[PDB]
Structure formats: C-alpha cells, structure tokens
Amino acid sequence: SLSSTPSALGKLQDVVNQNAQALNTLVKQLSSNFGAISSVLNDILSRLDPPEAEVQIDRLITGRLQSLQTYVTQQLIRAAEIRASANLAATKMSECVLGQSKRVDFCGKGYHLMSFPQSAPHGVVFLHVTYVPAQEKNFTTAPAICHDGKAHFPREGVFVSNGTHWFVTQRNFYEPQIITTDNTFVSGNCDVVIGIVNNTVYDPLQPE
C-alpha cells in the first residue's frame, strides 16, 4: 500500500513543501522594488546622490523587513501546528507502542492490540494492529434465565439460543458452553427481570 500509493505520505510532503515555498517566497521578495527605483541596493547607491539614495534604501529596508516578519510569523504558526502534531505522536507512542490503549479509534480502527513505530523523514509512522470481527451470526437472546425460581445472569458473557438450546458465550467471540452455576451468578427472583426465559441450569456437583 505504501509503495503503490504516494499520496499516503502526503502529510509529511506537504510540511516539506510548505517550508520550501516559504523560503522561496522569502528569497523572491528580494527581487521586488516596493516602490524603489531598483530592487538592487548597489544600483540605488550608484545612481543617486546620497540624500536621495537614503530614501530609496529606507524604502527597500521597510519592504524587506515586512517580508521577513511575515515569514517569521507564518513559521511561528506552522511551528505551533507541528508542535501539536508532535505532542499527539508522542501521546500515541506512549499509549499504544508502550501499552495497550482502550481509547476507541485512537490507534487504528477496531479493538487495539498493539502498534509499531517506524521512522520517516520529519515524522513518525505508526502501524496499528487491531482485532476486527469478520463473520457474524444472529442468535436469540434473553437478559436472564429462570430455573428454580431464581434469576441467573452471566458472570462474563451473554446468553444465546440456537433455536432449541440455550448456551452462554463470550461477548466478542461465539464460543457456546453449557450454562452452569459456575458461569452464572444468581440475584433476585424470576418475577422482576423483564423477558426472563425458562431454562435448565446445570449443577456440576449433582452427578458427584
């Protein structure tokens, strides 16, 4: 992707180009008259009598100084933009390269796994490795299961049905397991929870 699509790296090239343009503009301003008889200081000094040359030179001084201050001001603003970018890059380096971030879309789309820095001219490129669901199925669910008059809730998961039997799975991956007293916890009776479904709950101790 990086080899075939050069626009991918446009963010860094634009910074280079912007500074190059500013420098070329700064140089180009030296060729302007700004109202003077000539853009060249030596032509003014050779053509005019001192008191006249002083006026023409002061005019060129004003023009060049205004151009230089304009250059510095735009460099201060662009530098502030670069500082903000560098601070964001440092934050991402600390939170995603040296840790697993839980911030959504902070370091790539999907759920963050890890990241790797790469050096680039006047910048940093982060490769963000994320976990992304690929295939899904629809299952019938319920907020709780009613068994012996008490309401059973998953400890770490969701109750699903495959059309004839109820199972409990992890939320981010389909992995059906038998619903047991170890997978669920009990709180309250079967009368309070809205949409509770009647089902068997397996007790691992009863066979032994």
Binding site: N19, A86, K92, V125, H128, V129, E136, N172
Partner: protein
Amino acid sequence: FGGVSVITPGTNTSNQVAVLYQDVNCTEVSNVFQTRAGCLIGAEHVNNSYECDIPIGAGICASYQTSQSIIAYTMSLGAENSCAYSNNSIAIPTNFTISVTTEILPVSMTKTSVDCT
C-alpha cells in the same frame, strides 16, 4: 466581482475543464448549472449521487465520468445499512481478522536561520 475557479480532471486524464463563478448568477455570466456555491459551466448535472471526488461546495462535487465528460452531482455520504434493531436477538462474531493500518504524523520542521542584516 466573484472569483473564477477551474475544475479539471487533471492534465494526465483530460484537457476538458469546467469554470465556477463563486457567487455570480448564470444569468449575468449548454451544461450551465446554477448551484448554491455559484454558477458552474461545462459540467453536466446528473441525478445519481456518487462519492465526492473534486469538491465544489454546498454538498456539490464534480468528477470525470463516462463519451467522457465532467459530471456535477450531489455527493453521497456513505453506504446504506440495515440497523435491524430487535428486542430478542443479538449478532455475535463467529470468526475474526487481524487488521493493520497506518497513521502518519509530522514530528519536526526543517530548522532554519535567517540573518536580518
């Protein structure tokens, strides 16, 4: 006194251009399309919405499409999908993939120094 902008597919694609008058009514200025963003001359307006290519403004974009000409259109915002809300069913992943993406950030500016004298 509005500005004049040239909309081009690019030198390496086509030498046809469209000209946008930013705030001039087409009555004051043949594929002449009056938009909220100005009078666009040379682009053919179509009803079909497409992903934005060359932005014009106020929801209007232009692109080079098939015989070949510049087409003006209202930009599409995204693919459609079914929310499929249900009070008794959940969708759960059965498979997964690993995705790697790239984020590029500037870190530093070229260091320069200019002698005032």
